[PDB]
Amino acid sequence: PLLSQISNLNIQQALIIRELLFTLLGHEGHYIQYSKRYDPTSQISRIEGPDYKIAKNLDISLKVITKKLVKFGKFYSGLKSFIQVFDNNKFGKIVQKFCS
């Protein structure tokens, strides 16, 4: 369903919560989408994590609260991609143990 079509606050809150549970793990949702600047090919882009854009039809208060929480998905995705890069022999025992 379109986000603008829904007018009730409770429905919007539940929908954004359902979409947010997956966002916190780094996945896209129906109403939270990756920014066009995020290129998975680039190493630095993967390490720094993806930036998310929120659908313009969300309620203003819910949009602000979501914009605060979105950063946690960014950190998780960045760390998960950090492990898959820095955990090899060429980066030494210190970095490997930190990846642990």
């Binding site: 606050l9 309620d59 203003i60 208060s61 602000v64 609260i65």
Partner: protein, 79 residues
């Protein structure tokens, strides 16, 4: 009294979001979160009461700004 007294439970719907220092559909911060604008359709009495309640919101927002800004910048251990 309902027919003879006009004013916007609806306040309590959007009040929690304002108390946590976040923008609301009927209350909007401005000037770097230093003032809060009470909308039209809030007659004298309710506005006068809210002016006391909103003291917590603005003060908490200022404290949150300070905490977020100086979290890991200050070098002195005391601060």
């Amino acid at each position: 009294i309902e027919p003879y007294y006009d004013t916007l439970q609806t306040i309590l719907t959007y009040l929690p979001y304002t108390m946590l220092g976040s923008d609301s559909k009927i209350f909007t911060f401005s000037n770097n979160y230093t003032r809060l604008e009470i909308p039209k359709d809030i007659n004298n009495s309710f506005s006068s009461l809210l002016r006391e309640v909103f003291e917590f919101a603005i003060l908490y927002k200022q404290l949150a700004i300070v905490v977020d800004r100086y979290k890991g910048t200050l070098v002195s251990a005391i601060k």
